[PDB]
Each structure stands twice: as structure tokens, then as C-alpha cells.
Amino acid sequence: MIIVSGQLLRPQNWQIDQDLNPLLKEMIETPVQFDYHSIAELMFELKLRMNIVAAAKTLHKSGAKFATFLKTYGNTTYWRVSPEGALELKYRMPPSKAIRDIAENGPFYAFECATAIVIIYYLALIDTIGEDKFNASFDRIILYDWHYEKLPIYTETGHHFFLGDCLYFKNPEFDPQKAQWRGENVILLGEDKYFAHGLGILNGKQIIDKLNSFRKKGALQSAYLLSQATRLDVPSLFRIVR
Amino acid sequence: MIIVSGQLLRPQNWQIDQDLNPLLKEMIETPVQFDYHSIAELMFELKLRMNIVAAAKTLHKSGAKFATFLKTYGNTTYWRVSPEGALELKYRMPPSKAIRDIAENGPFYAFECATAIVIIYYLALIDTIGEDKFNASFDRIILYDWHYEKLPIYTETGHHFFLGDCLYFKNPEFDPQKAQWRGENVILLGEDKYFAHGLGILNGKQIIDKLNSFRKKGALQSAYLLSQATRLDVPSLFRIVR
């Protein structure tokens, strides 16, 4: 359900990018309410969300690897690794150049799946608003777990998902000697289609089966898709940038 | 105006912490709308906001000082300082305790005013959800500008403000040679009463006048209070406790 100003948007024709149509159909048909001040905001969400999808695929293809925090590394042209495994943007380096380098020199990087999600958000935002506006607003950067600079992010409960969502597979009876498998953050790329950093681009069964193989002795509870979604607050983000 | 589960909340008696009644009454009477899925959820917001106010006051009295990023320091028992000026939680230090140390050993810390706001949010959250839930969720921490570990924070346009809001005094024609005076992030502690890291607890006039004394030659634009509020998203946070 899409509401622009206070008018409900029904099947009302438009000359927009085709690859946006599937998402827009989801957002119109869903019971979930999307409120916008304007069409430009809605258009920003559509493009940002499909750019999140594209960026996840870009990261997947990049050659960047999975590593635990203590094994994390990056291109020292742009990033310093803290002892705890944070990737710190070096003094006065351009944020967009440094973040895009992850895509362009993937082999020089390895990091965690949460870190990968934030990276994907930044890559998508850069693709959406351009290097100049991104650098102006998100001018200091450290990539580390779920740290982000200024981004307005929220997580909500429910079973209705949309392309570009960040979702989570929980593995409740994971093997305690392998806490790395307690669950998996993913980007929703398509119907039953996920980006999962370190695992690849897989469907749900694949992810759940993989998780289920690293459970404790005698474990009976299967891994499963949590009913929640982590999302960028587009009106708030629109405000910062545009 | 408070609406809970689709029902308006008008004056209705309750057995709650007196400390919360002013804010509650303020949030009922105002024309702006607050929506909750439960009473528990509203109670969380009242407590969280009053804890933000208390935390600002705590930081004020702690002895923690203002410093630029390049001059930022912290208690090295808990925090390492990156070259760029980030305060990085040391490997396997308890997050709640490291953050609380800012209040308990204030003179060992100096940091910038965005960093200060984030610290106040963490201090308030610990007070609101307790150390166990805090440490379970916010298990990795770097204090640096507007970096957040999982915090759901957004900024909206408006001119109706409430206790615990984060506001901004802008200095459009600040002296380019004194960039720290670009503006001042504040927490609203009461009517025309602000916590301003590095300035103290001041009214609006005092902050504007202070800012105005660090403007370029011949400046005809006064520093002024922006029509915006920075806020924690309660439903995202409330997920944690229920």
C-alpha cells in the first residue's frame, strides 16, 4: 500500500525503468503501508532498493571473501584494519572511491556477512545519488559488523518482504563450537533468492540445509527464515541527501 | 496525540513513575501524532526519552571534554583511539561497562559533539533495556562521529520538539578557519534548555550568540535552530525487550 502525500496510489501509464516494475507491484499490492511526501521519494526507494539488489550481485561477483573479524583484511590504499578487525577509512581518502574499490579489487578484501550488508548499502547509495553527494554526507567511514555512518535503518516484524530487504536465517540449535553458524544475514534478490556473503547466491532451502549441518548433537530444531526485515528509511535518507 | 493500537489516548489515573507524567502529558496534548502497538511500547518511549535527558546531564557532569577528532582520547583500559580519531572498544571488553566508564571516568575522555550524542544514546539505552540485553545486542562498538552499531536513528523535519530530541543549531556563515563552529548538536532537556557538548547547559540565545561570535567577517546570517529533530525509532528498539 503506497501513500503519496495523503493520496493512496492505485494502478495509475507511468514511464519508468522496467526493472523497477516488479518491486513497485509488490509495494502497491501489499497490505504494508509505504508513506511518502512525494513521488520523487517513492522513485528514490524503488531505485535504491533495486540498486541494493544489483550491489549484492556486484559484491558476490567481486572476489571479496568471507573472513572472521580477526582475519579481516582490505586494500591498504584506502583501509586500515584495526586489531579487532574493523576496516577504517584512512585519513582524508574519498569514501566513495574506497567503498567502490571493494567492488573493483575484491580479491584484496575479506570480511564478515554483517559488514557485507553495510557495504552493500553504501554501494547501492553511491549508485543512487552519485559519488559527490555520498562523499559530502557520509564523509567518515568504518566498516565493522553493523556499524553505519548516519544511515537511518530500522528492523520490523512481519512476513511481507520486498526486493532489497535484509533478512535473517536463524539457526537456533547451532553448534556452540561454531558460533559462526548461529544464523545468516542475507539480501532478498528475488523470490526465494538470496545473497549470502560467504555462501553465495542461494535459495532458502539451500541456506537452511547448510545451517542445519552445523547444529549441536541431537538437535531437532531446523534453521528458518525469521519473520522480520531490516530496511532503510527512505524519507529520512532522502532528506539527508537529495 | 497518542494513538495506541488504533485507539486515541486522552487523559486516563495510571500508576507510573511520576517522572514520566510531564512528557506523557506533553505527548498527548501536542498536535503531533505518536503511534504505538501497545502500552508497553509507549512506556518504553517515555522511559527512553527521560533516560536520554538524564544521560545528557550525566555526560555534562562527568568531566568528559570536547576534543576534535584528531585530539580525541579515551580510557585506554577499554578504548583504543584510531589515527583518524575513532574510539574503538578493545577486544573482548564488556560493552556496557566500557560505555558506562565514560560517565564514571569522564576526565579520561575527550571527543566531538556527534560522538557525544551517540554516547548519550548508548548510555540511555543501557539504562532502558539493561546491561544483559545491551551486551547481547550491541556487542561491538566504535564511537566516531555518527557511527551506530545497529541503532535505528532518523532525522525528520518539524518544529514540535520533545524531551530527549537531538536538535541542531546551524551556523551557516561560520568562520571557515574555525570549522568546529559549523553548528552544535544538542539534546533538549526542557523548554529552551539544551545540552551542548563542549559548551554546557545553555538556552538557545546563548548558543546562537556563542556561534555567532565565530562567523566570517561581515556575516549577515545568524546561527539558528533548524526545524528538524533526530530521534530513536521506538518500535525498532522495542523489538529488543519484547
Curated annotation (Swiss-Prot), chains A, B:
GO MF annotations, alphabetized: protein-glutamine gamma-glutamyltransferase activity
Summary of the knockout phenotype: In cells missing this gene some GerQ multimers are present, indicating that tgl is not essential. Heat treatment for 20 minutes at 60 degrees Celsius, which maximally activates the Tgl enzymatic activity, causes cross-linking of GerQ in isolated yabG-deleted spores but not in tgl/yabG double-mutant spores. Additionally, the germination frequency of the tgl/yabG double-mutant spores in the presence of L-alanine with or without heat activation at 60 degrees Celsius is lower than that of wild-type spores.
A GO BP annotation: sporulation resulting in formation of a cellular spore
UniProt keyword Transmembrane, yes or no: no
Claim: Cell membrane is one of the keywords in the record: no
Catalytic EC class: transferase
Record's function text: Probably plays a role in the assembly of the spore coat proteins by catalyzing epsilon-(gamma-glutamyl)lysine cross-links. In wild-type spores at 37 degrees Celsius, tgl mediates the cross-linking of GerQ in higher molecular mass forms, probably in cooperation with YabG.
Family recorded in the similarity comment: Belongs to the bacillus TGase family.
HAMAP family: Tgl
Protein name from the UniProt record: Protein-glutamine gamma-glutamyltransferase
Species: Bacillus subtilis (strain 168)
Gene behind the chain: tgl
